[PDB]
Design an enzyme around this catalytic site. Structure first.
Site, PDB file in Angstrom:
ATOM      1  CB  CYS B  22      36.460  41.010  40.356  1.00  0.00           C
ATOM      2  SG  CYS B  22      36.152  40.260  41.984  1.00  0.00           S
ATOM      3  CB  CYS B 277      48.058  45.548  42.165  1.00  0.00           C
ATOM      4  SG  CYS B 277      47.300  45.267  43.802  1.00  0.00           S
ATOM      5  CB  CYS B 319      48.638  40.450  44.486  1.00  0.00           C
ATOM      6  SG  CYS B 319      47.338  40.552  43.221  1.00  0.00           S
TER       7      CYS B 319
HETATM    8  S1  FES Z   1      45.021  42.955  42.521  1.00  0.00           S
HETATM    9 FE1  FES Z   1      45.354  44.305  44.223  1.00  0.00          FE
HETATM   10  S2  FES Z   1      45.590  42.959  45.950  1.00  0.00           S
HETATM   11 FE2  FES Z   1      45.378  41.608  44.228  1.00  0.00          FE
HETATM   12 CL   LIG Z   2      38.565  44.233  42.107  1.00  0.00          CL
END
Ligand code: FES
Ligand SMILES: [Cl-]
Ligand code: FES
EC number: 4.4.1.28
Lengths: 368, 368
Positions: B22, B277, B319
């Site tokens: 990740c 994000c 998120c």
């Molecule tokens: S960091 Fe993108 S969905 Fe959680």
């Molecule tokens: Cl990721």
């Protein structure tokens, strides 16, 4: 099992669970226009309606029940034809007049302001007489004219917003007879809104929830002559709090006792979340969906506080879209997303607060 | 005609790459490896500065080739890895439990409230200092000064392309790009392991189950790569997995799968270039467009309607919850992308929609 709490919850339930024929935007205009109590609508020289933009935008896409028309103009006409004693069921029994519609169109002025809920009506008579009406705030209180109250104080709702989840779990185990009738009427009314298919993916539990919730929501939106049971003066919060549970029950045990308790817990949670929250933007799904995930979790796991806290946490982490698009289909889409978030929260455990109370308070702080 | 083909092909080779773990752990590992310490056991002190938006999303992320979770093994993995590997720094490392215990005593973590930030400061047992800094977006290496490897005006031209340009490209795909698309399908399908969000069996619940399963595989730190789109493995999962699952549930057309996956990647890169994000707002837009092409073909009226409904039913954006929060957001993205193919209404067209979601993501980022 405190009896002081039982009377407080009962009074709040009777005050926050009410029937409304049509969406809030048109129904509120109809009620405010009916409050002027004009004897002859054809004796009017001028009508000015003052609406806030936050609410009342999207009124153009809302069908006015018993008129076969959409928007503000038919809602005002419907108010001139309805009775103020009917409150949010003002459009009930009205005989729409196309003659009065054309008469009023060339006499109606709309003023739009940028403020919390506001619906004022000013009317000038062909004899110089003036008539004023005013409904204000998300609690829909009639400011003008002064009406007799059934009378929830600010300290009463302050006491209710300090209650625990366990208090609602105790209440649903010894429900008063008057509240059982209210819950059964809520189940019947909101189940009657289910008509044509809106979003049917499949036959399983989740798709029945999505399809029935979006169907009830579309029926209100198009101006069908069916009342809805609103929770905390929101017909959308009413649908979101009751329909995903009614559909879940149909797909599972069809247990009327479990359904009453799960629906009641959902309404109790929906009112609680609304009282803790501050308004500025939507919240139908964040408050009504929190009631739904809690109510569904009770149907699925019973009086299990560890499960209830885990569903509140997962729901808060998987919270749907902050802003609703409105229009003719926007709310239905948000409600379908609310179904998915509430249903899926019952299968994932997280680690957004540490428990139900902290979660409701966290969602309240995000309302900025 | 052919100028566009070379531009799209170069961007496709530059934005579709393998990523081991990740972003949170991989970014720490890359920033630590950028100091290029010869002897990790000659370190007196290490201070890592992380923004909270990536610190909270890293406390439980598995670090590949370590069998451990969190920041401590990611720093150790960075001390063992090579900076020339970039986002694949953990590849081939031989984890040292001796170095882990040595570093735990000298590691200080500073958390700040800001956009993406990952700085590393190291003091030598000889007084010498070594600094590293990645900020705003991974691979933006501020310290040390490095020559630009991957490729502003090219992206600007691609940002001005139409949806029709991507629809033409998928009808005459170069051989090198078909191999890349097939590798993407294989890699991201290999991430599907244990069932995470079942809901029984349906096209929708299959998409949800496979997408959340691939995400969980990465989250636990398995030594299996993912095909990332514009870096970010989550964006690659969101752009490819719902289409792979839809194809498995309806027909099994490898030709349609390649074209639908490619269109999804093209749209995902486009949305990213037109920008917090946004894994689901950008990757999910690629998914709804790609699914709409699989379902309706080269129909521009359908594609415009799919983007509009997706934009109106846009999921969360911010998120929370943690790493499991990403799997929940991707499950919500599945629902929004799938359901958008059955409702017609926002922008008005594909280009206006991508530009609108881009403007609202900026407003969400300005909250903190
Ligand atoms: S960091 Fe993108 S969905 Fe959680
Ligand atoms: Cl990721
Ligand atoms: S106004 Fe609340 S869901 Fe649309």
């Amino acid at each position: 099992m405190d009896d002081y709490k039982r009377i407080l919850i009962t009074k709040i339930l009777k005050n926050e669970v009410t029937e409304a024929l049509g969406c809030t935007e048109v129904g509120l205009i109809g009620y405010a226009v009916s409050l002027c109590n004009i004897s002859d609508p054809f004796s009017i020289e001028k009508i000015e309606l003052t609406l806030n933009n936050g609410s009342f935008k999207n009124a153009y896409a809302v069908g006015v029940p018993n008129t076969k028309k959409y928007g503000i103009l038919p809602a005002v006409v419907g108010g001139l034809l309805g009775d103020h004693k009917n409150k949010l069921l003002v459009f009930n029994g009205i005989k729409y007049s196309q003659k009065l519609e054309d008469f009023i169109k060339e006499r109606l002025k709309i003023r739009v302001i940028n403020s919390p809920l506001y619906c004022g009506v000013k009317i000038k008579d062909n004899s110089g007489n003036t008539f004023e009406s005013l409904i204000k705030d998300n609690h829909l209180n009639v400011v003008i004219p002064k009406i007799n109250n059934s009378e929830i104080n600010g300290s009463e709702k302050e006491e209710y917003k300090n209650l625990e989840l366990l208090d609602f779990l105790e209440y649903i185990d010894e429900i008063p007879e008057e509240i059982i009738q209210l819950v059964e009427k809520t189940i019947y009314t909101n189940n009657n809104l289910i008509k044509g298919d809106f979003l049917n993916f499949g036959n399983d539990c989740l798709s029945n929830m999505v399809n029935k919730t979006t169907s009830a929501c579309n029926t209100r939106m198009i101006g069908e002559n069916m009342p809805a049971m609103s929770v905390a003066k929101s017909g959308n919060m009413g649908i979101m709090a009751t329909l995903p549970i009614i559909a879940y029950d149909y797909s599972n045990e069809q247990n009327q006792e479990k359904l009453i308790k799960s629906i009641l817990l959902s309404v109790l949670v929906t009112i609680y979340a609304t009282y803790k929250s501050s308004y500025l933007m939507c919240g139908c799904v964040s408050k009504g969906g929190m009631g739904a995930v809690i109510g569904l979790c009770y149907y699925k796991n019973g009086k299990n506080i560890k499960k209830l806290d885990s569903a509140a946490r997962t729901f808060t982490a998987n919270l749907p879209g902050i802003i609703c698009d409105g229009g003719k289909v926007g709310c239905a889409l948000k409600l379908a997303s609310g179904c998915f978030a509430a249903y899926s929260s019952l299968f994932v455990d997280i680690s957004v607060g540490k428990n139900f109370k902290e979660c409701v308070e966290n969602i309240s702080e995000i309302s900025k």
